[PDB]
Design an enzyme around this catalytic site. Structure first.
Site, short mmCIF file in Angstrom:
data_model
loop_
_atom_site.label_atom_id
_atom_site.label_comp_id
_atom_site.label_asym_id
_atom_site.label_seq_id
_atom_site.Cartn_x
_atom_site.Cartn_y
_atom_site.Cartn_z
N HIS A 132 27.26 2.12 11.38
CA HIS A 132 26.76 0.86 10.79
C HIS A 132 25.94 1.15 9.53
O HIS A 132 26.22 0.53 8.51
CB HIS A 132 25.93 0.06 11.80
N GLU A 133 24.94 2.02 9.67
CA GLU A 133 24.03 2.52 8.59
C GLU A 133 24.80 3.32 7.54
O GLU A 133 24.39 3.25 6.38
CB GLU A 133 22.92 3.33 9.23
N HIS B 15 26.45 0.90 5.22
CA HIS B 15 25.40 0.32 4.34
C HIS B 15 25.09 1.28 3.18
O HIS B 15 25.13 0.78 2.03
CB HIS B 15 24.14 0.02 5.10
N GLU C 107 25.16 -7.64 5.90
CA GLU C 107 25.33 -7.20 7.31
C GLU C 107 26.62 -7.83 7.85
O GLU C 107 27.28 -7.19 8.69
CB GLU C 107 24.12 -7.62 8.15
C1 LIG Z 1 19.21 -1.29 14.80
C2 LIG Z 1 20.26 -1.83 13.81
C3 LIG Z 1 21.49 -2.16 14.63
C4 LIG Z 1 19.88 -2.95 12.78
N1 LIG Z 1 19.76 -4.15 13.38
C5 LIG Z 1 18.50 -4.86 13.36
O1 LIG Z 1 17.55 -4.70 12.63
C6 LIG Z 1 18.48 -6.09 14.28
C7 LIG Z 1 18.61 -7.46 13.41
C8 LIG Z 1 19.58 -8.42 13.89
C9 LIG Z 1 19.45 -9.78 13.61
C10 LIG Z 1 20.35 -10.68 14.17
C11 LIG Z 1 21.33 -10.24 15.05
C12 LIG Z 1 21.54 -8.89 15.26
C13 LIG Z 1 20.60 -8.04 14.71
N2 LIG Z 1 17.32 -5.94 15.08
S1 LIG Z 1 17.60 -5.60 16.64
O2 LIG Z 1 18.99 -4.92 16.51
O3 LIG Z 1 16.32 -4.85 17.20
C14 LIG Z 1 17.47 -7.06 17.74
C15 LIG Z 1 18.27 -8.18 17.37
C16 LIG Z 1 18.06 -9.33 18.24
CL1 LIG Z 1 18.95 -10.75 17.69
C17 LIG Z 1 17.27 -9.29 19.29
C18 LIG Z 1 16.63 -8.23 19.65
CL2 LIG Z 1 15.58 -8.37 21.12
C19 LIG Z 1 16.67 -7.25 18.85
C20 LIG Z 1 20.77 -2.93 11.61
O4 LIG Z 1 21.77 -3.57 11.63
N3 LIG Z 1 20.43 -1.96 10.48
O5 LIG Z 1 21.41 -1.99 9.52
ZN LIG Z 2 23.23 -4.44 9.14
#
Ligand SMILES: CC(C)[C@H](NC(=O)[C@H](Cc1ccccc1)NS(=O)(=O)c1cc(Cl)cc(Cl)c1)C(=O)NO
Ligand SMILES: [Zn+2]
Length: 385
Positions: free
Chosen positions: A208-209, A212, A230
């Site tokens: 994923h990273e 990016h 994203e």
């Molecule tokens: C860790 C990584 C996968 C990261 N994702 C996040 O920061 C998500 C943000 C997000 C927002 C909406 C939907 C999906 C993701 N943070 S998270 O993965 O810690 C998360 C998302 C949600 Cl919706 C709930 C929770 Cl408890 C935690 C990312 O994509 N970096 O490029």
């Molecule tokens: Zn992302």
């Protein structure tokens, strides 16, 4: 992809295993060069963002299941060596896929552009796209790199791909490129559902990273202001919600940016540095931006080679297309509130392996992704706070 096995104890040699200095823009850290243009820092990220290294919980944090804060993670060499052995494993897992191999190949070749001089007739490195490798006499030697994998800051599960910017230049969004720093830990993973069902394969989280950094490495990242960026990156079904005439509008904005690179090179007369010649670095980018070279020796941007590269980078390289290749289970969309962070150790070949991840062949785990199930395989997944 990583030719030689690294240990964190392994002695520094100032070529690959070295004490190094991040652009600030401070103290040296041990860091390994697991491949051309890719270095791995087994430390917590207290470096990239001025004093964001108090490394100790906020006033009130999101807790379960979004924030984790252990002030001690990645302090022991034993953890740092497990970390590098962690990250080295996910890269080869990723490399084993025809698509991860093309991706890293796309990452390695995506040299951040040499747009660092106020003049338009001269190539010059942007020191932000460089690290300082300490040599035997304490002195430092700028090395160019494309990617750094360093551990997280306070929030351990806050994985992201960030980059140093410019006074005037948006380096991730002007075709140029910028050295990418990926905050990541393979010693933890997020649980999802479809009772707490399953758990994300960290290779998917890593992939994923790398998507990016790839976008930012090639300068075709969408302005952060769910993000479009994203959305392009996770892929699949939710990558239809994107106005195609906002996708056209960009796939043309990064052609005219790629044509402005080809201009800057053609108009180049001098270059800065001892390292490399004007002609060596023009072939380097003529290799990055798949340019075309007439008899005169003037670069052009082929609209066809650019469209396959942009397609490959933006809609072939996606979390969703990765889970196809990895035969794994992953959240089918970006809205699946990961309702746990689990402790893990993917290093042992009995725990997790390059070829099947957690879902080990010749075991109970190879069916209905039972390797990824937090219940069935309770040893390999210990829910946290
Ligand atoms: C860790 C990584 C996968 C990261 N994702 C996040 O920061 C998500 C943000 C997000 C927002 C909406 C939907 C999906 C993701 N943070 S998270 O993965 O810690 C998360 C998302 C949600 Cl919706 C709930 C929770 Cl408890 C935690 C990312 O994509 N970096 O490029
Ligand atoms: Zn992302």
């Amino acid at each position: 992809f990583v030719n030689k096995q690294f240990n964190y104890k392994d002695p520094v040699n100032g070529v690959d295993i070295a004490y190094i200095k991040i652009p600030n823009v401070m103290q040296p850290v041990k860091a390994f060069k697991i491949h051309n243009k890719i270095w791995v820092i087994p430390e917590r990220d207290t470096f990239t963002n001025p004093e964001e290294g108090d490394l100790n919980p906020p006033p009130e944090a999101k807790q379960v299941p979004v924030s984790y804060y252990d002030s001690t993670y990645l302090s022991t060499d034993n953890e740092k060596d497990n970390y590098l052995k962690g990250v080295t494993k996910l890269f080869e897992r990723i490399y084993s896929t025809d698509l991860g191999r093309m991706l890293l190949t796309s990452i390695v070749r995506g040299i951040p552009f040499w747009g660092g001089s106020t003049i338009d007739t001269e190539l010059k490195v942007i020191d932000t796209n460089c690290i300082n490798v300490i040599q035997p006499d304490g002195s430092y030697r700028s090395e160019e790199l494309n990617l750094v994998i360093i551990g997280p800051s306070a929030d351990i599960i806050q994985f992201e791909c960030k980059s140093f910017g410019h006074e005037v230049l948006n380096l991730t969004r002007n075709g140029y490129g910028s050295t990418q720093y990926i905050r990541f830990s393979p010693d933890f993973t997020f649980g999802f559902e479809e009772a707490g069902k399953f758990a994300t394969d960290p290779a998917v989280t890593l992939a994923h990273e790398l998507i990016h950094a790839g976008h930012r490495l090639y300068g075709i990242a969408i302005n952060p202001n769910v993000s479009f960026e994203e959305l392009r990156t996770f892929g699949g079904h939710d990558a239809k919600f994107i106005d195609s005439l906002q996708e056209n509008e960009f796939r043309l904005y990064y052609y005219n940016k790629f044509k402005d690179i080809a201009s800057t090179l053609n108009k180049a007369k001098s270059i800065v540095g001892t390292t490399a010649s004007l002609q060596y670095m023009k072939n380097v980018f003529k290799e990055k931006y798949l340019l075309s070279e007439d008899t005169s020796g003037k670069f052009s941007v082929d609209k066809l080679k650019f469209d396959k590269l942009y397609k490959m980078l933006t809609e072939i390289y996606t979390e969703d297309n990765f889970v196809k290749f990895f035969k794994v289970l992953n959240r089918k969309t970006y809205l699946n509130f990961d309702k746990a962070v689990f402790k893990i150790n993917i290093v042992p070949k009995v725990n997790y392996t390059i070829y099947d991840g957690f879902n080990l062949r010749n075991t109970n785990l190879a069916a209905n992704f039972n390797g990824q199930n937090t219940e069935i395989n309770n040893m390999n997944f210990t829910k946290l706070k």
